[PDB]
Design a protein around this ligand. Structure first.
Ligand SMILES: CCCCCCCCCCCCCCCCCC(=O)OC[C@H](COP(=O)([O-])OCC(O)COP(=O)([O-])OC[C@@H](COC(=O)CCCCCCCCCCCCCCCCC)OC(=O)CCCCCCCCCCCCCCCCC)OC(=O)CCCCCCCCCCCCCCCCC
Ligand SMILES: CCCCCCCCCCCCCCCCCC(=O)OC[C@H](COP(=O)([O-])OCC(O)COP(=O)([O-])OC[C@@H](COC(=O)CCCCCCCCCCCCCCCCC)OC(=O)CCCCCCCCCCCCCCCCC)OC(=O)CCCCCCCCCCCCCCCCC
Ligand SMILES: CCCCCCCCCCCCCCCCCC(=O)OC[C@H](COP(=O)([O-])OC[C@H](O)COP(=O)([O-])OC[C@H](COC(=O)CCCCCCCCCCCCCCCCC)OC(=O)CCCCCCCCCCCCCCCCC)OC(=O)CCCCCCCCCCCCCCCCC
Ligand SMILES: CCCCCCCCCCCCCCCCCC(=O)OC[C@H](COP(=O)([O-])OCC[N+](C)(C)C)OC(=O)CCCCCCCCCCCCCCCCC
Ligand SMILES: CCCCCCCCCCCCCCCCCC(=O)OC[C@H](COP(=O)([O-])OCC[N+](C)(C)C)OC(=O)CCCCCCCCCCCCCCCCC
Ligand SMILES: CCCCCCCCCCCCCCCCCC(=O)OC[C@H](COP(=O)(O)OCCN)OC(=O)CCCCCCCCCCCCCCCCC
Ligand SMILES: CCCCCCCCCCCCCCCCCC(=O)OC[C@H](COP(=O)(O)OCCN)OC(=O)CCCCCCCCCCCCCCCCC
Ligand SMILES: CCCCCCCCCCCCCCCCCC(=O)OC[C@H](COP(=O)(O)OCCN)OC(=O)CCCCCCCCCCCCCCCCC
Ligand SMILES: Nc1ncnc2c1ncn2[C@@H]1O[C@H](COP(=O)(O)O)[C@@H](O)[C@H]1O
Lengths: 347, 320, 50, 459, 100, 49, 120, 19
């Protein structure tokens, strides 16, 4: 791809996200989602192989169906309210359809069935964009429509997302599918606390984007797409095994790391509203996420898998990749729990 | 780096330096075809840059100080021990062939990087498109197993597809008896143990697979052992080729930009040489890998990045 | 100093002792105010504990 | 407590800026200086706990665990420097960093004034222990053992997080000093039953309770020697410390919620001692002995009389020293015969007489020979459980008989009889090994002289 | 066959190259100085000075104070005919009972 | 010399080192000026001078 | 929660009433911890590119430290501002609603009857 | 007697399409 065209297309992805984030009119929200999908389709087809065309087709079908259900929710809102302000929805049917549409856009279960296929079909940078930047705009719309979100619907989507993203990653050996099922479980964690305190939703989204950006940047810098290709990293760059160790231990929610911060604040704000069973079942279900994270740490950092002979040639060459913000993202994903009351800047 | 997308934006297009002399030439032949002097004379008549045939220590010649490393750090294989025991127990045959394929891939990346950064053509000797003839010869001679051929075909399938074939392939017909005459007059005591059926399998895989499949994607030239002695007839045949085949015609600035971004990041070039297919001829266990890696770090000028070694005389490190 | 590494842990202890004695000043809201230990101040003395 | 946290953090540049032949000596020296400095925490009072700041305090329960923790680090460095001699220098510094960091987590685990800080440090102590077991463990089972060690503790402790945040929302605070005065009675309801379980089951896993102890004879066996020392000496006692804090809040519901767990521990001290009678692995014999000893500490916390708490904290300190020394003796034979099978190396008193004297004294402290603090803690727990019910003397006495049996069976099997003929790499005892044994045993014997500093907040 | 692996290295003896080995390191000067650091800073410092320090703790948890205070209180309330201890910890005048 | 190929970090990029030190010094003087302005504004708004 | 408070004046990182609050000192332990994070980012940046970790790029390590301190100072200002806003709104809502916050008649323990549960 | 590191049989458990 032309680098000019690449920069313009990424600016158009960011522009669609910003148009969703700033606009007060529902048509402009829908326009922002349309512009976002229309611009991210070439990023998924950057390498032009049949898995990228299949992934882009599945992504197109899901996001197109969600955009049309979003416009139907907007049209039922225009019926029952005569106006277009992006605020609460004045009909439970419009609220249900818009919550379904945003659940399809986020890939929350049971609309999750595209996320590991599409994430496997595309490169690691486009998978990074899909699993971090494409979560921003629907969570902004859910942040704005929450006076009308049905509680039972959003918590059903949340716990079903956490459970299916827990069980999905246990069978995986491809790194992109592990990150996709991690995405489904963490989106369940984000939407579970939304109607209770959406500041903790934004905290979970920010910590999640930091940690997922760290893992995709480490996977890009090591050029590893499978578990067993990540297993050769100790014989190539041993510092990378340390960084993926501490970042996978962070994403599992272990103290004293900063991946414990969001789930601890979510449990903290759900027990205030007299919900005890639900954050306890969510916390126990996240142990599955921790299990396949520890599987990856066993294969990468805590043991030494056998390498091959041709690694000796790669010893003689440094990484000439732009590992952009990788030390910054590694520090922020692990050592931020002493700065836990920094979350008030998102209030 | 040096060249990135920003230099492509600011004007460094590669068809501005791509003249008509900028050709990729690969000289091929059997084990003692004598094609080294042919490649060097063709490279000096056409004004090109000659690359010698990549051995075990080619990566040693491009990195560090250019002197060859010990064989435990580079290769873990011996051409002489392949010549002496081609059916050896320790798996030196496929391990030598796989290290040589990675060495020729690194050489081909260097060749394309020179061709695309300077606009000067390159003469090569036995590139990665012709490396498989020794694989098929060693399999027909029973020197390796079939799973080694499967491993080679996997690595080749995921690596050779990312590159453009040469412009000119110069093959040198030298028969088996003349090759053996030159082997016996060479006087190499390891190389004189090569069987006739191995050389015959090399020539058969050449004439039956390599040139019939390269004749579509490039322009093949073919010479005997005496008409390749005159370099000027070969250079005259090169200069009067009507270049019309192969995928070099539909190469704009964007495709060659992506190729130049590929061939300068050597770890991406060498990415799929070490795929995790645990084949016992090339799989190195963890204790040997750990020990050899820690000893490779202690080699002088190897502990850090190339600008960052005080023990070889790098200064201003605290401002780098 | 030729042996500069042997003053990391002892100077760390001196610094931690200093910070503990500094925090005792911030926790001085009941100095000479407790019903068990309140008393008139002796001359040439402004605080009962430091 | 900052005067102990800061030098423990300064052990990190002390272990990363040391010369490559000096990284054991410097960390050993300065951790011995920190262990000397640990004795300032004995400024205890009969009414008030030594309350440092809003974040840190130390009563007479946390103080012996702190001194034992800060004493355990140089001994772990001495124990673990022989089998990590051929290690890479960077991986050796990483091992020492994991030990220093585990001490750093523990010394502000025991001093946590507020209970969610205790929870964060308490579950932070998993990560260096997990890295030590799954990285510098010796056999294949270290990965599975790290899985069991991680996923019993988090399965127990994630209900504890919800319980503590519930107390934070109800009482308004998880400060233990405020909860000493704002504690309300916890009546009988199903809500308070699961409140009790959520507050107690994490520490029941960490002790370990019988029936939940299955992480322990794999984590304590498949660890290296420094991992085995810290797991046997401190990380089981995190559970008893958390119980003695958190059972302030669980009254009067503990007076009938304790019965199933008192039955589990009174029968588990019989069953795990019986398991010790038939172990082939010496290191697993010491692991099940640790389960058998911590069962009494569980019973003593659950009956919550003053004699029971005094005996439980004395038995925790005594068992930390004794079990750490038993693992170090097991390592001293494993570094010669390269097998943990107890029947392999026999007759070792004929070859190593002073090391056999150390075996004798650690087996005597294991069987609670008076006047050791082993017998002091054992005896006070037996007094309090007799006052609880008069029929528990049968189980306590039968446990003491089986305890003497497996202790002296361990001694006779490894040290007595005819020596094994085909084993000829039995070196003499190194000065490092005998010094390690003496630095375990001599504080354990000197604490019999003045035992009041290990009898907890209510001596 | 099976892969390329180094053989099991023989376990080294510290007494072969150094018959005066204290078991800390194979460098003999590092070994002797590790011996002196361990022995001095453990036994000569921590054990000896800590046995002295615990031996002379300033009335650890005020037990000696409590014995002396109890001697003073018993010496008081023997001379005045008061009972040595009340069954009521607190004065019944300053306790309101729940009426019935 | 040592290396057969000139490393990209053989010489320090003096432009990038100068911009690094200049940007860092600019952020430090801006931070000190901001902090002095902030304590001055706090003492002005609360009348503590 | 407090999203209607900062909706009259949107996208203000530090409002004008944040200046009534005392700024964090430059010796704040939070800000010193953020500077330690800058030093750690400098060390990881030297490690992943195989530079000497403590020595190489002291200008780069110093820009890491400076940039983290520079961002974290304003982050601490916004943190202290938002918690001051939270306490200010709490106290004004308690003042405007006395019927919802009755001053509790505190009894002493001579009248408070607590059921005694013996441990025996 | 040295530290167990994973062999080929261990690492082929992580090489399938699924786990
Ligand atoms: C505010 C939010 C800021 C968010 C981050 C902004 C920068 C990243 C985005 C763009 C990008 O990738 O730029 C590359 C990026 C470096 O990231 P990289 O690709 O990993 O490079 C690593 C190597 O250091 C590259 O080294 P090099 O050899 O190529 O050259 C050295 C380089 C040369 O430096 C320069 O060239 C700078 C001078 C020119 C600047 C531009 C002028 C136009 O100096 C550095 O890179 C030193 C490290 C700078 C700090 C990087 C991280 C910044 C802080 C991020 C926020 C942290 C918040 C923590 C909060 C904790 C509590 C929640 O940034 C820079 O090169 C300049 C950073 C300037 C920081 C200013 C902070 C205050 C702003 C107000
Ligand atoms: C600091 C922490 C972060 C450091 C990151 C970089 C570490 C590094 O590169 O070390 C090497 C470097 C020395 O190495 P070298 O000779 O240059 O060359 C490296 C070799 O090539 C190394 O040989 P190799 O690479 O060829 O092969 C050996 C292999 C060995 O590796 C393996 O075999 C693989 C792993 C083995 C198993 C895993 C072991 C554990 C390792 C990870 C730690 C996990 C636990 C962390 C905490 C628990 C939560 C997860 O890899 C390494 O050793 C790579 C080097 C990294 C080792 C240390 C890793 C540090 C990062 C992880 C911990 C910190 C971040 C997470 C914190 C989380 C929250 C507490 O170490 C140091 O220099 C250490 C720092 C000493 C000076 C500290 C000075 C402090 C001054 C403070 C005051 C001034 C600032 C004031 C600011 C405020 C102003 C207001
Ligand atoms: C604060 C100031 C304190 C000053 C007084 C210190 C109080 C005692 C401290 C600890 C004493 C034991 C440590 C040495 C023995 C371990 C090493 C060994 O085997 O050496 C043999 C070796 C001579 O034997 P060898 O023939 O050359 O070689 C050994 C053979 O190859 C093979 O060896 P073996 O089998 O032929 O000979 C071993 C033999 C084997 O015999 C036994 O195992 C039988 C022992 C048990 C039954 C008899 C005792 C029952 C309990 C009654 C006594 C306690 C209460 C008495 C009060 C009246 C009743 C209330 O055991 C003994 O001879 C030990 C004698 C002392 C027994 C103490 C109790 C140990 C039993 C287990 C715990 C019992 C509860 C705790 C009691 C704590 C009392 C403080 O001894 C030495 O060279 C001595 C080295 C220096 C020892 C220093 C000890 C104190 C260090 C503290 C430093 C810091 C404070 C400064 C004060 C320093 C004062 C000197
Ligand atoms: C080691 C592995 C096993 C660990 C076991 C851990 C303990 C077992 C029981 C845990 C229960 C869940 C935490 C309860 C926290 C109590 C907080 C509270 O306020 O309670 C009162 C509250 C009361 O509700 P409330 O607080 O909203 O109302 C106020 C109080 N009343 C009712 C008086 C008005 O209790 C609950 O809301 C529910 C408590 C029970 C929850 C049952 C779900 C979990 C079932 C057991 C799972 C055990 C682990 C399984 C997985 C193991 C690994 C695979
Ligand atoms: C502490 C918790 C963590 C545990 C691990 C700690 C590891 C770190 C270690 C730090 C240093 C050690 C700290 C604890 C030290 C304990 C020792 C100590 O202080 O003791 C003070 C005790 C205190 O006793 P005391 O309380 O009566 O002291 C009187 C008090 N003053 C001095 C103030 C008036 O000292 C003594 O008892 C000294 C008595 C003289 C020496 C011993 C004589 C008897 C020896 C045996 C005689 C023969 C008997 C027959 C048997 C023959 C053989 C079988
Ligand atoms: C309420 C919230 C409001 C909004 C807050 C902010 C949200 C931030 C969300 C960040 C999402 C980042 C998505 C990834 C970057 C997008 C552009 C991109 O793809 O850059 C990667 C780039 C592409 O290069 P290419 O060559 O195509 O890749 C193949 C590898 N040769 O180059 C590469 O591939 C090189 C490899 C390194 C790439 C690293 C990129 C890291 C970028 C993210 C940093 C972390 C996010 C910012 C901090 C936290 C903010 C919350
Ligand atoms: C083997 C693995 C290792 C060991 C792991 C831990 C094992 C023990 C953990 C659970 C301990 C038993 C449960 C608590 C027992 C204490 C007293 C009690 O509640 O008894 C059960 C109850 C008796 O009835 P009662 O108590 O009178 O009911 C009124 C309650 N407010 O009984 C009933 O009312 C009937 C039954 C109710 C449901 C019981 C099961 C769910 C609760 C426990 C989980
Ligand atoms: C590093 C971050 C630097 C931020 C610079 C200032 C950007 C800005 O103008 O932010 C405005 C925003 C406060 O605007 P507000 O109206 O409170 O947002 C409503 C959101 N629901 O301010 C903020 O959101 C500040 C916090 C941003 C933190 C981003 C990384 C975490
Ligand atoms: N499998 C192989 N067997 C023998 N020679 C090989 C093999 N692969 C590459 N070669 C090279 O082919 C060369 C023969 O051509 P020449 O350079 O003229 O000697 C040898 O020197 C080897 O370096």
């Amino acid at each position: 791809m032309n680098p000019i065209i690449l920069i313009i297309i990424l600016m158009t992805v960011m522009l669609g996200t910003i148009i969703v984030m700033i606009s007060t009119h529902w048509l402009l929200i829908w326009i922002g989602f349309e512009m976002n999908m229309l611009a991210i389709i070439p990023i998924m087809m950057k390498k032009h192989n049949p898995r990228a065309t299949e992934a882009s087709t599945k992504y197109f079908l899901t996001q197109s169906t969600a955009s049309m259900l979003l416009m139907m929710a907007i049209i039922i809102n225009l019926m029952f309210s005569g106006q277009w302000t992006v605020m609460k929805l004045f009909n439970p049917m419009a609220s249900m359809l818009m919550t379904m549409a945003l659940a399809m856009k986020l890939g929350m279960a049971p609309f999750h069935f595209w996320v590991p296929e599409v994430t496997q079909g595309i490169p690691l940078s486009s998978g990074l964009i899909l699993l971090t930047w494409q979560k921003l705009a629907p969570m902004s719309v859910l942040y704005q429509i929450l006076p009308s979100i049905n509680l039972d619907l959003i918590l059903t989507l949340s716990i079903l997302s956490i459970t299916i993203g827990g069980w999905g990653g246990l069978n995986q050996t491809q790194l992109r599918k592990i990150m996709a099922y991690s995405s489904i479980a963490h989106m369940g964690w984000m939407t579970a606390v939304l109607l209770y305190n959406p500041t903790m939703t934004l905290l979970n989204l920010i910590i999640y984007i930091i940690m997922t950006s760290t893992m995709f940047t480490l996977f890009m810098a090591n050029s590893t797409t499978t578990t067993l290709s990540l297993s050769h990293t100790w014989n190539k760059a041993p510092i990378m095994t340390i960084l993926v160790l501490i970042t996978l231990l962070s994403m599992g929610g272990l103290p004293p790391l900063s991946g414990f911060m969001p789930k601890w604040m979510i449990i903290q704000e759900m027990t205030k509203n007299d919900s005890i069973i639900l954050p306890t079942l969510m916390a126990i279900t996240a142990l599955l996420n921790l299990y396949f994270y520890m599987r990856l740490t066993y294969s990468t950092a805590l043991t030494m898998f056998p390498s091959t002979n041709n690694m000796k040639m790669k010893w003689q060459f440094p990484t000439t990749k732009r590992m952009t913000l990788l030390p910054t993202m590694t520090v922020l994903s692990t050592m931020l729990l002493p700065l836990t009351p920094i979350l008030s800047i998102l209030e | 780096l040096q060249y990135g997308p920003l230099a492509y934006i600011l004007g460094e297009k590669t068809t501005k330096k791509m003249t008509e002399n900028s050709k990729l030439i690969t000289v091929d032949g059997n084990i003692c075809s004598g094609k080294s002097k042919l490649a060097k004379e063709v490279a000096e008549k056409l004004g090109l840059k000659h690359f010698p045939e990549a051995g075990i220590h080619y990566a040693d010649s491009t990195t560090g100080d250019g002197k060859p490393l010990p064989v435990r750090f580079s290769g873990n294989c011996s051409l002489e021990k392949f010549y002496d025991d081609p059916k050896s127990n320790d798996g030196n045959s496929y391990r030598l062939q796989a290290w040589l394929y990675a060495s020729r891939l690194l050489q081909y990346a260097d060749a394309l990087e020179h061709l695309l950064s300077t606009g000067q053509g390159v003469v090569l000797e036995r590139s990665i498109y012709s490396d498989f003839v020794f694989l098929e010869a060693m399999y027909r001679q029973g020197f390796i197993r079939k799973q080694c051929v499967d491993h080679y075909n996997q690595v080749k399938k995921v690596t050779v597809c990312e590159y453009l074939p040469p412009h000119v392939v110069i093959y040198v017909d030298v028969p088996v008896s003349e090759v053996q005459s030159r082997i016996q007059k060479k006087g190499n005591p390891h190389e004189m143990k090569i069987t006739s059926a191995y050389l015959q399998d090399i020539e058969n895989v050449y004439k039956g697979t390599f040139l019939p499949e390269m004749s579509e994607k490039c322009e093949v030239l073919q010479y005997s052992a005496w008409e390749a002695e005159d370099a000027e007839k070969v250079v005259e045949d090169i200069q009067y080729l009507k270049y019309d085949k192969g995928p070099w015609l539909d190469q704009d600035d964007r495709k060659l930009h992506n190729l130049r971004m590929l061939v300068q990041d050597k770890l991406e070039v060498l990415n799929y040489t070490s795929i995790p297919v645990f084949l016992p001829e090339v799989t190195i266990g963890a204790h040997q890998s750990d020990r050899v890696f820690q000893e490779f770090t202690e080699l002088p000028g190897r502990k850090y990045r190339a600008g960052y070694n005080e023990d070889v005389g790098d200064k201003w490190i605290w401002l780098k | 100093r030729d042996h500069w590494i042997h003053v990391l842990v002892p100077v760390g202890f001196v610094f931690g002792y200093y910070l503990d004695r500094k925090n005792d000043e911030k926790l001085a809201a009941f100095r000479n105010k407790s019903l068990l230990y309140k008393r008139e101040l002796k001359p040439q003395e402004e605080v009962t504990w430091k | 407590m900052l005067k102990y946290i800061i030098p423990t953090m300064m052990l990190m540049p002390l272990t990363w800026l040391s010369k490559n032949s000096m990284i054991w000596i410097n960390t050993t020296l300065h951790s011995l200086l920190i262990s000397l400095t640990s004795l300032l925490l004995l400024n205890q009072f009969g009414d008030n706990s030594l309350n440092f700041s809003l974040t840190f305090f130390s009563d007479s329960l946390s103080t012996p665990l702190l001194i034992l923790t800060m004493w355990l680090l140089p001994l772990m460095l001495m124990a673990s420097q022989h089998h990590l001699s051929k290690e890479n220098l960077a991986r050796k510094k990483l091992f020492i960093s994991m030990l220093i960091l585990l001490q750093l987590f523990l010394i502000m685990t025991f001093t946590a004034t507020e209970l969610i800080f205790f929870y964060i440090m308490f579950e932070a102590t998993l990560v260096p222990t997990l890295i030590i077991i799954t990285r510098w463990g010796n056999q294949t089972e270290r990965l599975n053992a790290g899985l069991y060690f991680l996923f019993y503790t988090l399965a127990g402790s994630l209900p504890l997080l919800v319980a503590l945040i519930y107390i934070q929302n109800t009482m308004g605070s998880l400060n233990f000093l405020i909860l000493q005065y704002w504690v309300q009675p916890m009546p009988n309801s199903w809500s308070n039953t699961f409140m009790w379980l959520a507050c107690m089951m994490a520490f029941m896993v960490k002790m370990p309770l019988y029936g939940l102890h299955l992480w322990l004879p794999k984590a304590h066996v498949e660890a290296p020697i420094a991992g085995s020392m810290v797991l046997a000496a401190i990380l089981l006692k995190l559970g008893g410390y958390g119980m003695m804090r958190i059972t302030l809040l669980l009254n009067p519901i503990t007076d009938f919620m304790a019965y199933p767990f008192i039955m589990l521990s009174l029968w588990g001290m019989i069953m795990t001692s019986s398991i010790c009678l038939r172990q082939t692995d010496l290191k697993s014999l010491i692991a099940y002995s640790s389960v058998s000893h911590m069962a009494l500490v569980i019973v003593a916390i659950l009956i919550q009389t003053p004699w029971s708490y005094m005996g439980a904290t004395a038995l925790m300190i005594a068992h930390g020293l004794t079990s750490s020394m038993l693992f170090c003796l097991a390592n001293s034979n494993y570094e010669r015969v390269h097998s943990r099978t107890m029947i392999l190396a026999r007759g070792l008193q004929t070859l190593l007489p002073l090391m056999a004297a150390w075996w004798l004294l650690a087996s005597l402290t294991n069987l609670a020979l008076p006047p050791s603090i082993n017998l002091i803690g054992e005896l006070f727990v037996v007094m309090s459980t007799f006052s609880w019910s008069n029929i528990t003397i049968i189980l306590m006495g039968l446990n003491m008989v089986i305890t003497a049996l497996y202790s002296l069976y361990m001694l006779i099997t490894t040290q007595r009889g005819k020596h094994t003929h085909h084993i000829n790499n039995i070196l003499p005892s190194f000065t490092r090994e005998n010094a390690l044994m003496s630095l375990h045993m001599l504080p354990l014997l000197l604490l019999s002289l003045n035992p009041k500093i290990i009898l907890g907040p209510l001596y | 066959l099976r892969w390329q692996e180094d053989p099991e290295p023989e376990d080294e003896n510290l007494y072969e190259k150094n018959p005066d080995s204290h078991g800390y390191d194979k460098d003999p000067a590092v070994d002797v100085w590790n011996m002196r650091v361990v022995f001095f800073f453990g036994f000569s410092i921590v054990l000896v000075l800590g046995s002295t320090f615990v031996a002379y703790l300033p009335d650890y948890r005020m037990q000696e104070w409590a014995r002396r205070e109890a001697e003073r209180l018993v010496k008081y309330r023997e001379a005045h005919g008061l009972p040595l201890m009340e069954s009521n910890c607190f004065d019944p005048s300053k306790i309101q009972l729940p009426e019935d | 010399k040592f290396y057969i190929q000139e490393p990209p970090h053989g010489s320090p990029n003096w432009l990038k080192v100068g911009l690094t030190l200049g940007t860092s010094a600019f952020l430090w003087i801006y931070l000190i000026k901001q902090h002095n302005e902030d304590v001055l504004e706090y003492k002005r708004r609360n009348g503590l001078e | 929660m407090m999203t209607g408070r900062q909706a009259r004046a949107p996208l203000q990182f530090l409002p004008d009433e944040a200046r009534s609050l005392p700024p964090p000192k430059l010796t704040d332990p939070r800000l010193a911890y953020i500077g330690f994070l800058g030093y750690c980012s400098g060390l990881i940046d030297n490690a992943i590119r195989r530079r000497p970790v403590l020595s190489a790029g002291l200008h780069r390590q110093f820009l890491y430290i400076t940039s983290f301190v520079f961002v974290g100072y304003y982050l601490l200002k916004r943190q202290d501002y938002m918690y001051a806003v939270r306490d200010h709104d709490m106290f004004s809502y308690i003042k405007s609603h006395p019927e919802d916050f009755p001053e509790k008649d505190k009894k002493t323990y001579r009248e408070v009857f607590e059921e005694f549960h013996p441990v025996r | 007697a040295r530290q167990w590191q994973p062999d080929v049989e261990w690492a082929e458990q992580y090489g399938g399409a699924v786990m």
